[PDB]
């Protein structure tokens, strides 16, 4: 059903079982998250994960580099699903094959159970976010953070370049001067809206994304294209990218 895309658990079961084109794209994301947090020096005390949705794959390597992680989403349902796993409930999603993959990428310094435990311990707060708001976390009493991570969670809320830029500028209020912004996102994306019977598209390319980051008050440390074009019946892009930036 297309309605499955409105259900956080159906979404997990459709794509993340890791047992496919999507699995190969996920390995590209995981290799680059490991590179960012564990080879390229993005480390510190406090990391805020924006638009976490119901997934934890984006935090597995990050929890080696940050003592505290705040996860957030605009949807209560996403966060309910995520909390099933954080609280170790039996009906939670089985992330074990993914966790095992990341432990192997990290050279098996930790085994899966110890990695899951380190992540659950690091997650200190589960909060609503809204990148469209000048105070995206609603002014919760968090001190300025060392990193904000935004993985594949902006295009639904930011339908065009100016709104994308403004969301990045709003996220900057969460970071200390010099604090890292890590974006992962899709170049020239489109997603088929079954209800409205049209694609909705966000034309991100390197030059436009770099400009949006720099006008949102960051300096770019590194941009990289990390996968080739992908096409399913319901989405397209011309590859995924990651970008590491520092707040002014």
């Amino acid at each position: 059903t297309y309605l499955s895309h409105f259900n956080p658990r159906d979404y997990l079961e459709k794509y993340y079982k890791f047992g496919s084109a999507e699995s190969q794209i996920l390995k590209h994301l995981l290799k680059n998250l490991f590179k960012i947090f564990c080879l390229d020096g993005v480390k510190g005390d406090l990391l805020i994960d924006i638009g976490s949705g119901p997934t934890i794959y984006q935090l597995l390597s990050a929890c080696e580099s940050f003592k505290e992680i705040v996860v957030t989403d605009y949807s209560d349902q996403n966060l309910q699903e995520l909390e099933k796993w954080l609280k170790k409930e039996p009906a939670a999603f089985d992330w074990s094959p993914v966790v095992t993959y990341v432990c192997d990428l990290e050279g098996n310094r930790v085994k899966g159970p110890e990695k899951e435990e380190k992540l659950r311990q690091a997650v200190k707060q589960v909060l609503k976010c809204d990148v469209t708001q000048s105070q995206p976390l609603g002014a919760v009493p968090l001190p300025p953070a060392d990193c904000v991570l935004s993985t594949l969670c902006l295009d639904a809320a930011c339908p065009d370049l100016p709104t994308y830029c403004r969301a990045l500028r709003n996220l900057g209020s969460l970071l200390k001067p010099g604090g890292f912004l890590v974006i992962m996102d899709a170049l020239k994306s489109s997603y088929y809206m079954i209800g409205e019977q049209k694609f909705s598209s966000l034309p991100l390319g390197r030059e436009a994304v770099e400009a949006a980051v720099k006008e949102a008050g960051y300096t770019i440390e590194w941009f990289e294209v990390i996968s080739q074009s992908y096409s399913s019946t319901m989405a397209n892009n011309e590859g995924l990218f990651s970008l590491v930036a520092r707040k002014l």
């Binding site: 638009g51 949705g53 997603y191």
Partner: peptide, 11 residues
């Protein structure tokens, strides 16, 4: 929503 891969979450 809709969460259609590679979309992961809702900022």
């Amino acid at each position: 929503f809709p969460l259609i891969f590679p979309r992961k979450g809702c900022g």
